[PDB]
Short mmCIF file of N, CA and C in Angstrom, two decimals:
data_model
loop_
_atom_site.label_atom_id
_atom_site.label_comp_id
_atom_site.label_asym_id
_atom_site.label_seq_id
_atom_site.Cartn_x
_atom_site.Cartn_y
_atom_site.Cartn_z
N UNK S 1 0.64 -0.99 -0.10
CA UNK S 1 0.16 0.04 -0.03
C UNK S 1 0.87 1.03 -0.06
N UNK S 2 1.94 1.22 0.50
CA UNK S 2 2.87 2.01 0.70
C UNK S 2 3.81 2.55 -0.75
N UNK S 3 3.96 1.32 -1.43
CA UNK S 3 4.52 1.57 -2.56
C UNK S 3 3.57 1.94 -3.87
N UNK S 4 2.30 1.73 -3.52
CA UNK S 4 1.04 2.18 -4.43
C UNK S 4 1.09 3.60 -4.53
N UNK S 5 1.60 4.41 -3.12
CA UNK S 5 1.14 5.77 -2.97
C UNK S 5 2.30 6.56 -3.89
N UNK S 6 3.61 5.36 -4.00
CA UNK S 6 4.81 5.95 -4.41
C UNK S 6 4.50 6.10 -6.48
N UNK S 7 3.99 4.98 -6.88
CA UNK S 7 4.01 4.94 -8.11
C UNK S 7 2.67 6.04 -8.55
N UNK S 8 1.83 6.27 -7.81
CA UNK S 8 0.98 7.21 -8.19
C UNK S 8 1.40 8.63 -8.04
N UNK S 9 2.08 8.69 -6.70
CA UNK S 9 2.80 10.05 -6.44
C UNK S 9 3.71 10.72 -7.47
N UNK S 10 4.22 9.69 -8.25
CA UNK S 10 5.23 10.03 -9.44
C UNK S 10 4.45 9.75 -10.66
N UNK S 11 3.28 9.46 -10.69
CA UNK S 11 1.95 9.63 -12.13
C UNK S 11 1.45 10.63 -11.73
N UNK S 12 1.06 11.48 -10.65
CA UNK S 12 0.46 12.58 -10.38
C UNK S 12 1.79 13.98 -10.57
N UNK S 13 3.01 13.76 -10.68
CA UNK S 13 3.97 14.27 -10.91
C UNK S 13 4.49 14.58 -12.31
N UNK S 14 3.78 13.42 -12.66
CA UNK S 14 3.68 13.38 -14.34
C UNK S 14 2.81 13.97 -14.89
N UNK S 15 1.60 13.97 -14.24
CA UNK S 15 0.63 14.79 -14.51
C UNK S 15 1.27 16.35 -14.28
N UNK S 16 1.60 16.26 -13.70
CA UNK S 16 2.19 17.92 -12.83
C UNK S 16 3.23 18.54 -13.94
N UNK S 17 4.38 17.86 -14.37
CA UNK S 17 5.43 17.92 -15.33
C UNK S 17 4.26 18.51 -16.70
N UNK S 18 4.18 19.56 -16.87
CA UNK S 18 2.99 19.92 -17.66
C UNK S 18 2.79 19.56 -19.22
N UNK S 19 1.82 19.70 -19.55
CA UNK S 19 1.41 19.42 -21.01
C UNK S 19 0.07 20.46 -21.50
N UNK S 20 -10.51 9.68 -16.54
CA UNK S 20 -11.89 10.03 -17.25
C UNK S 20 -12.06 11.12 -16.87
N UNK S 21 -13.35 11.58 -16.84
CA UNK S 21 -13.99 12.28 -16.17
C UNK S 21 -14.59 12.56 -14.69
N UNK S 22 -13.58 12.70 -14.15
CA UNK S 22 -13.54 12.37 -12.82
C UNK S 22 -13.67 14.08 -12.43
N UNK S 23 -14.94 14.82 -12.42
CA UNK S 23 -15.09 15.91 -12.41
C UNK S 23 -14.17 16.63 -10.99
N UNK S 24 -14.33 16.16 -10.17
CA UNK S 24 -13.38 16.59 -8.70
C UNK S 24 -12.27 17.12 -9.14
N UNK S 25 -11.33 16.11 -9.79
CA UNK S 25 -9.92 16.40 -10.17
C UNK S 25 -9.71 17.03 -11.49
N UNK S 26 -10.96 17.12 -12.22
CA UNK S 26 -11.17 17.58 -13.37
C UNK S 26 -10.77 18.91 -13.50
N UNK S 27 -11.90 19.84 -12.76
CA UNK S 27 -11.55 21.10 -12.58
C UNK S 27 -10.31 21.56 -11.99
N UNK Q 1 16.93 -7.35 -34.74
CA UNK Q 1 17.64 -6.38 -33.82
C UNK Q 1 17.94 -4.79 -34.38
N UNK Q 2 18.21 -4.66 -35.39
CA UNK Q 2 18.85 -3.34 -35.68
C UNK Q 2 17.85 -2.59 -36.34
N UNK Q 3 16.56 -3.22 -37.15
CA UNK Q 3 15.36 -2.70 -37.57
C UNK Q 3 14.80 -2.38 -36.30
N UNK Q 4 14.49 -2.82 -35.50
CA UNK Q 4 13.81 -2.22 -34.28
C UNK Q 4 14.21 -1.24 -33.27
N UNK Q 5 15.54 -0.71 -33.93
CA UNK Q 5 16.32 0.29 -33.28
C UNK Q 5 16.17 1.24 -34.29
N UNK Q 6 15.78 1.14 -35.47
CA UNK Q 6 15.33 1.60 -36.54
C UNK Q 6 13.98 2.70 -36.48
N UNK Q 7 12.98 1.54 -36.40
CA UNK Q 7 11.78 1.83 -35.83
C UNK Q 7 11.13 2.78 -34.96
N UNK Q 8 12.08 2.46 -33.99
CA UNK Q 8 11.95 3.03 -32.40
C UNK Q 8 12.42 4.80 -32.60
N UNK Q 9 14.01 4.76 -33.05
CA UNK Q 9 14.30 6.03 -33.55
C UNK Q 9 13.55 6.50 -34.40
N UNK Q 10 12.87 6.20 -34.82
CA UNK Q 10 11.52 7.15 -36.05
C UNK Q 10 10.43 7.27 -35.07
N UNK Q 11 10.14 6.94 -33.94
CA UNK Q 11 9.28 6.59 -33.14
C UNK Q 11 9.57 8.07 -32.09
N UNK Q 12 10.74 7.82 -31.76
CA UNK Q 12 11.14 8.85 -31.06
C UNK Q 12 11.54 10.29 -31.51
N UNK Q 13 11.82 10.01 -32.55
CA UNK Q 13 12.10 11.43 -33.73
C UNK Q 13 10.76 11.91 -33.97
N UNK Q 14 9.44 11.33 -33.56
CA UNK Q 14 8.19 11.53 -33.89
C UNK Q 14 7.62 12.26 -32.65
N UNK Q 15 7.89 11.62 -31.51
CA UNK Q 15 7.91 12.22 -30.18
C UNK Q 15 9.12 13.36 -29.88
N UNK Q 16 9.63 13.40 -30.77
CA UNK Q 16 10.48 14.80 -30.67
C UNK Q 16 9.89 15.78 -31.83
N UNK Q 17 9.85 15.44 -33.26
CA UNK Q 17 8.50 16.44 -33.87
C UNK Q 17 7.51 16.72 -32.69
N UNK Q 18 7.43 18.30 -32.58
CA UNK Q 18 7.28 18.40 -31.04
C UNK Q 18 5.40 18.47 -31.19
N UNK Q 19 4.90 18.12 -30.06
CA UNK Q 19 3.64 18.42 -29.58
C UNK Q 19 3.14 19.29 -28.25
N UNK Q 20 3.74 5.14 -21.08
CA UNK Q 20 2.76 5.22 -19.77
C UNK Q 20 3.85 6.52 -18.57
N UNK Q 21 3.34 6.17 -17.65
CA UNK Q 21 4.06 6.62 -16.63
C UNK Q 21 5.57 6.02 -16.29
N UNK Q 22 6.42 5.98 -17.25
CA UNK Q 22 7.99 6.18 -17.03
C UNK Q 22 8.69 6.55 -16.36
N UNK Q 23 8.77 7.08 -15.27
CA UNK Q 23 9.00 8.26 -14.71
C UNK Q 23 10.64 8.61 -14.88
N UNK Q 24 11.43 7.64 -15.58
CA UNK Q 24 12.73 8.05 -16.15
C UNK Q 24 12.34 9.28 -17.59
N UNK Q 25 12.14 8.61 -18.47
CA UNK Q 25 11.92 9.10 -19.84
C UNK Q 25 10.54 10.29 -19.51
N UNK Q 26 9.74 10.25 -18.56
CA UNK Q 26 8.62 11.40 -18.17
C UNK Q 26 9.19 12.58 -17.94
N UNK Q 27 10.08 12.73 -17.27
CA UNK Q 27 10.61 13.89 -16.42
C UNK Q 27 11.57 14.77 -17.68
#
């Protein structure tokens, strides 16, 4: 569960390093 | 194996000609 948060934190950091319809994180 | 590097070099050249979560090449 701890690593699952690391892989995700690295994915959101890739969604950070700039460029479905989950309204929450969508806006 | 030599052609596999050519098809890829042409794919990375397309990723070059500008516009998953492999952190390495991600950043």
